Amino acid sequence: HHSIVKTMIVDDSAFMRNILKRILSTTNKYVVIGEAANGADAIKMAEELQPDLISMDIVMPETDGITATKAIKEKTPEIKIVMCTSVDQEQKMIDAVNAGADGYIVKPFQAPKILEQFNKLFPVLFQGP
Amino acid sequence: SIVKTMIVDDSAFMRNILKRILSTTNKYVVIGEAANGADAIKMAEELQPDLISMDIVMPETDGITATKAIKEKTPEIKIVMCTSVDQEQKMIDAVNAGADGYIVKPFQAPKILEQFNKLFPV
Amino acid sequence: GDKLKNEVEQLAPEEQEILTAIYTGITSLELPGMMGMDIDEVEKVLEKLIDQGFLDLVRIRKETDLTEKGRAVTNFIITNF
Amino acid sequence: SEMAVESWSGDKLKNEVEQLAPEEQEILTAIYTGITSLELPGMMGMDIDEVEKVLEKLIDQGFLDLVRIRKETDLTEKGRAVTNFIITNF
Ligand code: BEF
Ligand code: BEF
Ligand SMILES: [Mg+2]
Ligand SMILES: [Mg+2]
């Protein structure tokens, strides 16, 4: 229904993960149900927690975010994954979209832009007055 | 843990206080707001919430009757009274109507969460 | 006794709502978004209620915006995050 | 506009950026994203006065400007009693 979006934040920077938590906390729909510090944990946690949405950094230990995006998507294609990374090279970005990424935000980002990003994948759905 | 939460109070500013407090939590999603009893009973049937913040003194239907109507229509809904009424008799009626918690306003924010977290623990 | 009740009666709804908000624990900072009010107007009401003794100025906090220097530095340091 | 991006070329920036402490780099990244300067101490494990000291340096260091000044106010025992008197209004 999109009134509640189980969200999973994947970034090796704890501070950046904390950034995305303040932003999503003020919203009435995005509930951070998990955090992964590396892509290998991102793969497993998405497997176990089945989030509706994953904010996915790219440059991370153990396994990158594009490899994580792809591996999560061939098990759970229903999961929406939005790359949240500082890599702005258009190639990596083509690679992310080809891996399954539904979104791509470049750090530094402004909070309304990433909610505007997230809200396209999970819009407010009106059934009528 | 996600608690679909419904806020029932005739004071708009008080539903606002209760929403702002539940916003900082990573648990409570306020999915509905009722300004009186009558609307709280049928909205509770609409949304099937996990938790209702229930005032008593309200324009159309009191919170006790609303609680009572919702509880043995939908007993799984945890109902917590949140109110300026401290008279023990009205309290007794709330608990006997089926209420699971009771907050006396004016309240502190950590105690709003303490009733709610007590009914949906981490 | 008489001074307070005239003050309580002269306390407009906005001021009653503020006082109720701080009691609950709502910091004086996120009051404007809760009342649909300008941040500058709410701060003048706070200044009205400290002078009349309903509130005490605990701490003075600054709200800040990045300079173009700031945004340039953030753009540079971002790979650390 | 974009003039500032060019005016702050890489050579000049690194001197001030290497000056900045890791925490101070965190205030800026958070403030950029939109997290208010009222919102950091509860997010950075820092006491509110340390943040305010750090903010005032970044306004002195030139990285920040002072949009407005915010009051942290608590109820006097008068106001605590007033709230308990007007609670029936809500
Ligand atoms: F480390 Be992330 F790709 F910004
Ligand atoms: F509005 Be009162 F707290 F019943
Ligand atoms: Mg990284
Ligand atoms: Mg009432």
Residue numbers in the entry:
A (entry chain B): 1 to 129
B (entry chain A): 3 to 124
C (entry chain F): 268 to 348
D (entry chain C): 259 to 348
Question: Which passages does the manuscript contain on this structure?
Answer:
In archaea, the adaptor protein CheF resides at the cytoplasmic face of the archaeal C-ring formed by the proteins ArlCDE and interacts with phosphorylated CheY. In archaea, CheY-P binds to CheF, an adaptor protein uniquely present in archaeal species, however the precise mechanism of this interaction is unclear to date. Binding of CheY-P to CheF induces a rotational switch of the archaellum. CheF forms a twisted homodimer offering two CheY-P binding sites within an elongated C-terminal tail domain.
